[PDB]
Design a protein around this ligand. Structure first.
Ligand SMILES: *C/C=C(C)/C=C/C=C(C)/C=C/C1=C(C)CCCC1(C)C
Ligand SMILES: *C/C=C(C)/C=C/C=C(C)/C=C/C1=C(C)CCCC1(C)C
Ligand SMILES: *C/C=C(C)/C=C/C=C(C)/C=C/C1=C(C)CCCC1(C)C
Lengths: 224, 224, 224
């Protein structure tokens, strides 16, 4: 296809596909109720990402948004991906630390706003307003990062506290990159071109989903 | 109206309407917490289907998708219907057998993918790619059917095991037809015309919702 | 901006923003699991409304629908707001009275239909059909009001029964106004112009979210 970024969409599609299949097969025969939850949640993440990457590869998950006197290619399918995958990833962390339901509802709500405002930002036709929505989404992200950092995992089992610590550190570092990439890429300032932006989001997505999942499902904390 | 398929949309609308009202009235005065859940879930299904059928009848739930050198009438409102009604139907089955939450999340996730990929298939403008999404959706269906077949209902009460068995058999046979109808109808190969396709989906929908519901709500398994 | 209704969108945006911030700060340091739920739910409501009001102010949450030989400005962003905020408000009430899950699923389902059918009504191009969807949505509202009125709060604590009583009375009176405003405004009969309609919805929204929240979070019923 004539779009330069197809290769990274293709690699993205393939790597999410492989990860889905790996987690499916790994979770076969697992009978422990708690372990089953973590496998269900963690396998769905790349499964969803696979379908959205495929949509981008085939050209369905793309549209043109006019701003700055140009038709700009915007991959809306990312936000459809992230709307479902990011709360599931937060839920993996929340179930691990046995978080109360009020805290879970706060994280998921804020995540919905973060993703929702991002999408509005992506599709906004007035250039200046795009950054207002970015700012609001980033504020929502910071709230999530604050809750993850400031907790009671050290009060319970060592395997749980240890695995939470690493997945928290991975999450905070990888998630924080997303707003930076948006800002400097096609959606924001347009400093880095769409092909490099697509490469960047692919490394981040695969790392935040497949990499994250491998760390979690190899841990002993997912069992009671 | 000039569309030949209106009569089946009208019949569909009427039969979902009657079924909603029947289940509403039947569930009046029911105070048992478990029974109330099943009535809530089972009454919502035709209520949702009623609204979407009405949308199709009035022409709101229809759009034209260009493929194969023709503007093809696509009823998108079906997928809006099914996105909500199919997980509720799976939940009726899951609550009946007291399925663990990991298994419930797996079924609902896979169902979301099945319906989501179906819709993308429905709206895709490149003919060949429509069948790629059909295949992925069908793969998601098979996963759901595998989980329903391979379970622990025989470990618990006889009324529960008996009612699960029949509703499982109805579900598997009726659900399996949907991908066949899509494939041979307007959305796929275009072998059967839209009016017959609409008739076929109406028989299936009414049977999988109203018929299914009658079997469930007349059973003694819904009570503790 | 050239739209007369901007001032009420601006005031709406500001008042939801202030309310979000007030509830955020008030809920800091609250460690009681039950209280945390109510703060999570109640803070998300204006947070969501803030983002949608902002969308309307900036012009994103608006589209033109042709009916009656005129392009009519329709703020679709309201329905996006209400789809999420109204079930959360019902959940505040349901958790307060310790409602069973069947009843919670009934309320939330009916609320989804109410909002969903409202949106279809809003975007329908055949004038007469707009009122059919209004009628169906209003029927769904009446069901919700019936469940709220006809319950067991008097069986449990006095602070809970007392706070439920006032929030029920506020809810029923404020919610009942919404269908009246739609009917007489731009979406329906077009008797009151869009600027007054926008003023009316803003008073209602702020009262049903911020006012409602203040009453709830100052009560002692949110604690165990
Ligand atoms: C599986 C993929 C993951 C974990 C994606 C995470 C994405 C974010 C944390 C995106 C954040 C954004 C902002 C906070 C600023 C606005 C632009 C977004 C949506 C990229
Ligand atoms: C109440 C209606 C029900 C139970 C509908 C069920 C629909 C399906 C199981 C549809 C399945 C499809 C595929 C697996 C292939 C792609 C086309 C679909 C979405 C019709
Ligand atoms: C936070 C805002 C609230 C509580 C909004 C409530 C809105 C309604 C109860 C709207 C009801 C409607 C009908 C029942 C008739 C159709 C038009 C609607 C959607 C305005």
């Amino acid at each position: 296809t004539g779009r330069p970024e197809w290769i990274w969409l293709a690699l993205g599609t393939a790597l999410m596909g492989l990860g889905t299949l790996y987690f499916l097969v790994k979770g076969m025969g697992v009978s422990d109720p708690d372990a089953k939850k973590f496998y269900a949640i963690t396998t769905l993440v790349p499964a969803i990402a696979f379908t959205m990457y495929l949509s981008m590869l085939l050209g369905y998950g793309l549209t043109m948004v006019p701003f700055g006197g140009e038709q700009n290619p915007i991959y809306w399918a990312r936000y459809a991906d992230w709307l479902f995958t990011t709360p599931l990833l937060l839920l993996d962390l929340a179930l691990l630390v046995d978080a109360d339901q009020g805290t879970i509802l706060a994280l998921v709500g804020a995540d919905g706003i973060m993703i929702g405002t991002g999408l509005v930002g992506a599709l906004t036709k007035v250039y200046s307003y795009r950054f207002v929505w970015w700012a609001i989404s980033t504020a929502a992200m910071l709230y999530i990062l604050y809750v993850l950092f400031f907790s009671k995992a050290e009060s319970m089992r060592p395997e749980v506290a240890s695995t939470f610590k690493v997945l928290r550190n991975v999450t905070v570092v990888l998630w924080s990159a997303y707003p930076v990439v948006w800002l400097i890429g096609s959606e924001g300032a347009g400093i880095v071109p769409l092909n490099i932006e697509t490469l960047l989001f692919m490394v981040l997505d695969v790392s935040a989903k497949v990499g994250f999942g491998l760390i979690l499902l190899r841990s002993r904390a997912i069992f009671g």
